[PDB]
Amino acid sequence: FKRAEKYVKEYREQEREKIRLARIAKQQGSFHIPAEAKLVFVIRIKGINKIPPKPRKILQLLRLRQINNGVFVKVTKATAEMIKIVEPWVAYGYPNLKSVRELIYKRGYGKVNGQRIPLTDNAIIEENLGKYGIICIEDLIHEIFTVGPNFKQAANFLWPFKLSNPNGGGNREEHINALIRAMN
Amino acid sequence: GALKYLEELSKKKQSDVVRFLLRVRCWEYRQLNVIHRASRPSRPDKARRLGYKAKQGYVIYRVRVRRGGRQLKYQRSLRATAEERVGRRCSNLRVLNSYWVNQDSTYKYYEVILVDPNHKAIRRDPRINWICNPVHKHRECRGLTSTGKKSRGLNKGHRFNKTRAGRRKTWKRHNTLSLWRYR
Amino acid sequence: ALEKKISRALGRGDVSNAARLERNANLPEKTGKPRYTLNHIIRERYPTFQDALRDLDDCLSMLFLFANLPSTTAVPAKMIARCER
Amino acid sequence: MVKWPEYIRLQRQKKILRMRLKVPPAIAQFQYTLDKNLAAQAFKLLNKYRPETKQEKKERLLREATAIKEVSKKPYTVKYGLNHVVGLIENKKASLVLIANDVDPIELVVFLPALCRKMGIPYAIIKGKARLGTLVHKKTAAVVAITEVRSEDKNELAKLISAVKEGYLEKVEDTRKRWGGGIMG
RNA sequence: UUGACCUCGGAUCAGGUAGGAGGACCCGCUGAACUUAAGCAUAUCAAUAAGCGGAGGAAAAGAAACCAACAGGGAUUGCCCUAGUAACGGCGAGUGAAGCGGCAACAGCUCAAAUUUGAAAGCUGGCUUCGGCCCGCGUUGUAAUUUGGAGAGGAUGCUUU
RNA sequence: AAGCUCCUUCGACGAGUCGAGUAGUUUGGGAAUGCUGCUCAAAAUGGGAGGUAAAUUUCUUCUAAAGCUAAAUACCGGCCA
RNA sequence: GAACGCACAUUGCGCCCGCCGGUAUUCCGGCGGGCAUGCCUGUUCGAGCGUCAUUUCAACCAUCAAGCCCUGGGCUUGUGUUGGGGACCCGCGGCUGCUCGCGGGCCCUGAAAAGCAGUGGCGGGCUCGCUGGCGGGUGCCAGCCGUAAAACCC
């Protein structure tokens, strides 16, 4: 059974999201960030129950549906506009070397033939990818950190990470490290 | 505040509210033990005006007493019998006072406010620690409570000539032949 | 009993008393230190140091694996960092 | 068959006796209690105006002591205590009165709805003296009252007052006078 | 599902307390008969003895719902006279006070009925490095203020620790 | 923290208790002298007790139903002298 | 002995925590410390078809950014409004006109309320025709635009 205050709250959130989407669509999508491409970790948090169609399309294009899912994403103009669309549901920022290293060493899984296996062998990842230049796990570690042409296939290869629910641990540039530190 | 209203209500004991409440409570008390511990006074205005304080060391004890004669009438009051029975159950406490709470066809129910003389909250309070003195051991057995003071006729006036200072002391004083040295 | 008190404070709506009681509890996720004080038991079980080394074989094996192990509800992250350190 | 314990049987029979007798109107008015939504709104406001616990009071007093070692307005709180609240109602200082429905010596509160009606203070009967107790950091509370508030939610208090006087007082207005209970049928 | 409240219980849990003795005097409860009235039953014995319960170095009583009719007195107790008077009574046996007056000794107070409400300001325990820290009691009322020949609150100006 | 003074402000005082009827018990004491049991059951310029033929109950004097308290008093017992 | 782990007319018989001696972690004997009842305060454990609370009604725009101009003062863009009523003053669009629209100035009202709802399309949805393809109706759209056609969708 569902009460009337839930209905009016829902409608108010949907309306506020609708005006906010109209505001960002009307205004020219230029962030206060230099034109150089960067790298940001994105972890999506519980927020609004009902997702508008453009945010759910962007979240599906960024493959974030399940509970506590995280993905690294480039920073250029189009991706800046995409992450500015889905700001209230995601939290993003610059990761650290130990953050990505520990996060892939504790929770790094792979996708092939539409199924998700744990990273068990380097022979497994070499059978999965083969010939784009990656030869081990440290290879995709510094491929994620140091910029290169092999971002897209490596990001499509990796399952996104199902981090454990914390017990209490906008935009920021360095507090995300403590977040994934407590998220793991 | 509210105790003035409760005093005025307690003064109408056959009105609908008070009659209803008295009957429901009488039913419950009848099915309880003869002498049972009461968590709080059922008549807080009456207990408060008799010296009950919501402080550790103060205890209420409800007691039922069979009503009627002993045509020899018992010169002891039913309220005095109640305090004596409770005082024996709680032999470590001092009977402070007691008051009527209910009456049935065969019983009269009374609540007895008792005080623990060994609790430190009572021994440190100059308003109650007089009861810690050993001259107040079993006040209900020597006619030293309110019922005892009434039944011994301890009042001022010509109507209480033979009992105002003690009946037996007055009788011994009147029946003593005083012979002085120079007669 | 202190778990009963912190549950009472949570059910009573007192956030500050809940914070005080969880500070007093020393619950081993915000600290990383062991929940209980185990000085006397390990004193009575190990009277000298070479027995401590003999069990430190397995102890250090457990800890190195645990430092390379991830974190869940029963095994939080802070004492995993303490394992690493 | 099996035998029930004595005090459980006393509890259930006291239930049946208090619900199936011809109850006088002053006691039968206490069976009509606020709904869930209005109690939730009232407790939102009263949770905004809770008193301070012992720890916060000593902490604040230590703060003033060290500030003196090295300006305020009147505090606004929920007023509690039976004699204090009765004195507030009689002097027409209280604005809203919430009376618990399960005071075991019910004489302590039977005159309270009539008193609030006479002096003109809006009142409502709430479910649970333990609920009012949690609000004032005590085990129980027979009655609570709100007299005056900070500016930023005065309007809200006014609406709440109007709410009870439109949502509880007129639904009680005809049944507050009638005897309750009975086994007719 | 979880957590309060209330009520009723358990524990070889912690800290305490009661019982018995003594009982000359004291406070209560209960309670006779012989005897006198030259018989005897009302009465007397006697509100005594026996019996039961409860204290102390004293107990009890005690600061007027008193005495009085005054030009008034002024908590209680006891001594002297009042006084074998008043009063009551098979008006027989008899029973039998008190006010005033003189003296000994003198002492007055605490609560309930109030909203601290600009702040439960109060208290029992446990831990202690003994200095201050926790749990609990308590708003169905613990401190302060007040106790009706009073009192409160403001103002006011002296006088007190 | 405390006493006093002043006043265009206030001033809450004890209920199965008084009392009425009735049965015992007790007293010099049917205003029942007091107490107790049963039935009924109060008041608020109120209530209690007295004074008075005096012209109507005029007047007088106190506040019950909560509590503490030394001394003067008793004493075949206790520690002694 | 009030007499107190049970009995008591026996120097007998049990429970909990420890020790010593004699073949001794197993057997025996002895020893040390505890174990009565009523009640008060606290502690802990437990019951109750006694009893209440448990589906955010919160915050979240820029608390300043970006670009100009003469680097010292400003300028520009950042589109963000509860609903009614009135015994008034206008302006501008329309209508053959009354009048109706859009925008102002003056008041009143609790976050107040008792029919009056009408302006044209594009897409998607539903429906019914023809042999996935072709056509129209719609008090459907928590989808866009303003009549000219898109955007969005896949």
Question: Count of residues for chain B?
Answer: 183
Breaks (C-N over 2.5 A) in chain B follow: 70
Element (H, E) at B112: strand B107-115
Strands (E), chain A: 38-44, 69-75, 90-93, 109-112, 115-118, 161-162
Strand partners, C50: none
**Å between CA of B56 and C1' of E13:** 20
CA dihedral B26, B28, B34, B35 (to 10 degrees): -100
Q: C72: which chain A residues are within 8 Å (Cβ-Cβ)?
A: 164
Residue B134, φ and ψ in degrees, nearest 5: -75, 0
- Give the tokens for residue A119: 């990273």
Q: Which of D179, D132, D183 is nearest to D29 (CA)?
A: D179
- D47 part of contact set with chain C, CB < 8 Å: yes
- Give the tokens for residue B40: 């709080």
The answer to whether B156 CB sits below 7 Å from nucleic acid chain F is: no
> Which residues from 108-167 of B have any strand E atom under 7 Å from their CB?
118-121, 124-125, 127, 134-135, 137-138, 141-144, 148-149, 151-152, 154-159, 161-167
Residue ranges of alpha helices (H) inside B31-177 are 44-49, 78-89, 120-123, 146-151, 167-174
- Rounded-to-integer distance, Cα C53 and Cα C51, Å: 5
Query: Which positions on strand F lie below 7 Å from a protein C-beta?
Result: 12, 14-18, 23-25, 27-29, 33-39, 41-43, 49, 65-69
Strand partners, D37: none
Going from the C-alpha of B147 to that of each of B60, B74, B97, B98, D53, the distances in angstroms are 18, 14, 9, 9, 45
| B102 nearest nucleotide via C1' and CA | F16
- B75-112: b or e for each residue (b if 16 or more CB lie within 10 Å)? eeebbbbbbbbbbebbeebbbbbbbebbbeeebbbbbb
CA dihedral C23, C29, C32, C36 (to 10 degrees): 60
- Rounded-to-integer distance, Cα B33 and Cα B67, Å: 17
- B1-37: b or e for each residue (b if 16 or more CB lie within 10 Å)? ebbebbeebeeeeeeebbebbbebbbeebeeeeebee
For residue B75, how far is the Cα from the chain centroid? 16
Flag if D84 and B27 touch (Cβ within 8 Å).
no
A134 CB-near residues (< 8 Å, 6+ apart): A125, A140, A143, A150, A154
Long-range CB contact pairs, C76-79, < 8 A, 24+: C76/A167, C76/C28, C76/C29, C76/C32, C77/A181, C77/A182, C77/A184, C77/C29, C78/C28, C78/C29, C78/C30, C78/C31, C78/C32, C79/C28, C79/C32, C79/C33, C79/C34
- Give the tokens for residue A79: 């991706």
> Which residues from 48-87 of B have any strand G atom under 7 Å from their CB?
56-57, 59
Q: C12: which chain D residues are within 8 Å (Cβ-Cβ)?
A: 134
Q: What is the 3-state secondary structure (H, E, C) of D139-180?
A: CCCCEEEECCCCHHHHHHHHHHHHHHHHHCHHHHCCCCCCCE
